[PDB]
């Protein structure tokens, strides 16, 4: 990177106060060079804080700038630690309003390598307590480093940059420690910096200091770029400037448009709930009256949010004519002791559909882009299509203009959208401020590339997020990414975008902790690659152990939403846990029945009423199902939804092993027939097994002879022999049938 990287890599000299000895043309040569070393940004990101670097001569405690003679503070503690007072020394950085440093003058800065470290030490402190503080200083990051090297094998690192305080202190540094100690860390941070910057010491550091290096490094040529910016967002007399500039460009676009246009550009911005009568007034005569007596709340199909909109879509009917409007309402709640109907489930199911919000974006992130998929109805289907097709061709302004450069947008969301299973424990649950490190890592671990299938709208300036919205993405779009400008201070940017998750620490935003999914865009093209190119290594690496024809397609992928970099890559643990607990001879034997009918282990992040391995082989749309777990005979394959947490399923792992077991209750159904495609569970020798002990293990234990087994077997496996043994003690009145069929399938 050459050229202008000098105009804007020195011009910042607009802080270079040279009250230097009249003897012209030297010092600068020294000053310029002296400063050359210190990163470019980390200079400016000082200017925008009262830019001024005093380079005067001789007696320095004389210069106007230094008149606040804190004679007490005058006892200048030197970087090494040897006491010393102003007069003597040659460069004190005075703090406070319009912070400043007074670098002494002498052609001797190039050579002398000490008053070269100090001038860096200071200009570093002036970076740890000030600049890199108005953001929130070294938070969790520089903490670890700041400790892993406090308790590292070779008790030496410490020795380099610490004190009895930090060195002797018991265990290790813990967040809170950033309390009335920020006046110590800040220093250790400096020293670290102070070194890495100085030419010779980068070397001495590197070796003597493990992690200090890297952190202190990264952060100076690849990470700084940020701090400067997440510090421009702080000040605001620009926070607008940006806003303005970014509009300007996008402005002309916003001018000529249309109501129709600016219209759906809204239809998108906000859903459009169903209707009141129109919906109801669209049912049948028979359908209408059926809708009355429904025992309504009983089916775990209709979630509260919409369950209510149904009891309500009921009153708009009951609110009509004769007395039975008073009596049926009573005579109906009479035999209100029987759960539900089988001719009515549908009567509601077929509704569970039509009563849907229609957000051309909650049914886009619902099908990776399958705007053509049979998850919804026929015409609805054809709208989004018609629509998503228009908006697309609607947002067509490149971006990168003659105005703004590397510019990042933002967005906040909740870990419950990526991986709800971790959602639960994301935040401490015992400090609602402190994020549970534990589940933190588990999150970050495999998160390198995320893709948003849908239309992204983004806050163009860190906007404080809510209380459940806990992730703060600082995505860095790029020249050529297309978006729109939505007054409000928010940009909508096209469909199908790629994001290389290039860092994910955790910050402190106004007394509360936050996860920072800071990323950067890349082409989905380059992303889908990394997937299949991985969809293989999994298969191949599995086909072996499993024992199938090299080059088969068992574990198939389907990830399009924000957590592929773990949607897919997770798998490994899932499957690996499937093998581990069960007995080889089994799965090897059965994983074949399935493949014998070209079935898969579909790890998906879209929605089960969209995953192919189930919809064409479905039957009728009025039905669908969806969730973590799923089993489908018509296409004997396993569908496992990555995000969604489970109804008493501690994790993805234990949700699969179950589901698969459901396929086992399929084996017998063929390992015992020519054409009675049944399920070991659909037997008279089993119905009993169910109508006796079929309700003892847990909640799921019911609703279907089958699932009592799925969960039964699911249980017999537990990471701990306990949870399983319970099935033995509880109802061997099944715990035998399982093991019986197990060591019944292992052979043919």
């Amino acid at each position: 990177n050459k050229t202008q990287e000098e105009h804007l890599k020195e011009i910042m000299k607009h802080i270079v106060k040279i009250e230097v000895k009249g003897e012209e043309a030297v010092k600068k040569e020294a000053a310029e060079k002296l400063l050359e070393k210190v990163p470019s940004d980390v200079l400016e990101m000082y200017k925008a804080i009262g830019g001024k670097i005093y380079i005067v001569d001789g007696d320095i405690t004389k210069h106007i700038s230094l008149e606040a003679l804190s004679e007490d503070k005058k006892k200048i503690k030197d970087i090494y630690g040897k006491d010393a007072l102003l007069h003597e020394h040659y460069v004190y950085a005075k703090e406070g309003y319009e912070p400043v440093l007074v670098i002494q003058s002498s052609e001797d800065y190039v050579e002398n390598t000490e008053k070269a470290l100090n001038v860096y030490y200071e200009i570093g402190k002036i970076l740890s307590r000030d600049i890199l503080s108005k953001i929130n200083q070294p938070y969790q990051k520089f903490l670890d480093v700041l400790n892993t090297i406090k308790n590292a094998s070779d008790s030496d690192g410490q020795d380099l940059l610490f004190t009895n305080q930090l060195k002797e202190h018991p265990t290790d540094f813990s967040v809170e420690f950033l309390e009335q100690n920020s006046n110590e860390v800040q220093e250790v941070f400096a020293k670290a910096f102070a070194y890495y910057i100085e030419p010779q010491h980068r070397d001495v550091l590197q070796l003597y200091a493990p992690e200090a290096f890297n952190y202190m490094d990264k952060f100076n040529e690849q990470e700084i770029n940020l701090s400067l910016e997440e510090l421009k967002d702080q000040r605001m007399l620009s926070r607008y400037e940006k806003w303005e500039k970014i509009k300007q460009h996008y402005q002309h676009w916003s001018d000529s448009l249309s109501e129709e246009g600016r219209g759906l550009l809204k239809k998108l911005q906000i859903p459009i709930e169903p209707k009141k009568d129109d919906i109801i007034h669209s049912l049948s005569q028979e359908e209408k009256e059926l809708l009355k007596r429904i025992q309504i709340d009983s089916s775990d199909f209709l979630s509260t949010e919409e369950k209510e909109f149904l009891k309500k879509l009921q009153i708009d009917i009951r609110d009509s004519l004769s007395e039975e409007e008073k009596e049926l309402l009573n005579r109906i709640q009479v035999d209100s002791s029987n759960p539900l109907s089988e001719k009515e489930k549908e009567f509601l199911k077929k509704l569970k559909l039509d009563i849907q919000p229609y957000d051309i974006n909650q049914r886009l992130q619902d099908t990776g882009g399958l705007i053509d998929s049979p998850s919804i109805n026929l015409d609805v289907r054809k709208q989004y299509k018609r629509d998503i097709q228009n908006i697309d061709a609607l947002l067509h302004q490149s971006i990168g203009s003659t105005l703004y450069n590397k510019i990042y947008l933002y967005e906040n969301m909740n870990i419950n959208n990526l991986t709800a299973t971790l959602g639960a424990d994301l935040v401490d649950s015992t400090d609602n401020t402190k994020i549970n490190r534990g589940i933190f890592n588990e999150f970050k671990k495999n998160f390198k590339y995320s893709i948003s299938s849908n239309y992204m709208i983004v806050d163009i300036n860190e906007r404080p997020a809510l209380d459940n919205e806990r992730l703060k993405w600082r995505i860095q779009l790029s020249p050529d990414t297309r978006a729109g400008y939505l007054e409000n201070g928010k940009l909508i940017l096209q469909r199908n975008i790629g994001l290389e998750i290039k860092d994910v620490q955790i910050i402190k935003q106004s007394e509360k902790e936050y996860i920072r999914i800071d990323a950067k865009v890349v082409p989905k093209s380059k992303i889908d690659t990394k997937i299949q190119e991985a969809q293989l290594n999994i298969n191949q690496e599995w086909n072996k152990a499993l024992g199938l024809p090299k080059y088969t397609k068992l574990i198939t992928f389907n990830v399009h939403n924000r957590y592929a970099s773990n949607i897919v890559e997770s798998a490994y643990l899932i499957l690996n846990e499937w093998k581990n607990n069960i007995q080889s001879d089994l799965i090897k034997k059965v994983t074949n029945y399935l493949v014998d009918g070209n079935g898969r282990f579909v790890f998906t992040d879209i929605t089960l009423p969209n995953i192919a391995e189930q919809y064409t082989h479905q039957d009728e749309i009025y039905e669908q199902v969806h969730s973590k777990g799923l089993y489908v005979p018509e296409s004997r394959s396993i569908l496992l939804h990555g995000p969604s947490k489970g109804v008493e399923l501690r994790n993805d792992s234990e949700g699969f092993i179950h589901e698969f077991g459901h396929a086992v209750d399929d084996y017998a159904g063929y390992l015992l027939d020519k054409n009675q495609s049944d399920l070991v569970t659909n037997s008279k020798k089993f119905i009993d097994i169910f109508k006796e002990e079929g309700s003892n293990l847990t909640s799921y234990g019911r609703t279907n002879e089958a699932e009592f087994f799925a969960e039964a077997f699911r249980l017999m496996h537990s990471t701990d022999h306990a949870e399983r043994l319970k099935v033995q003690k509880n109802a061997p009145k099944t715990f035998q049938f399982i093991n019986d069929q197990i060591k019944f399938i292992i052979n043919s």
């Binding site: 199909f301 979630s303 089988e342 489930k345 199902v625 969730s627 969604s644």
Partner: peptide, 16 residues
């Protein structure tokens, strides 16, 4: 706000 969450569940599949 960007949720919905409970798209559906079983029955027994009900037809031939």
């Amino acid at each position: 706000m960007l949720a919905r969450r409970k798209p559906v569940l079983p029955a027994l599949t009900i037809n031939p």
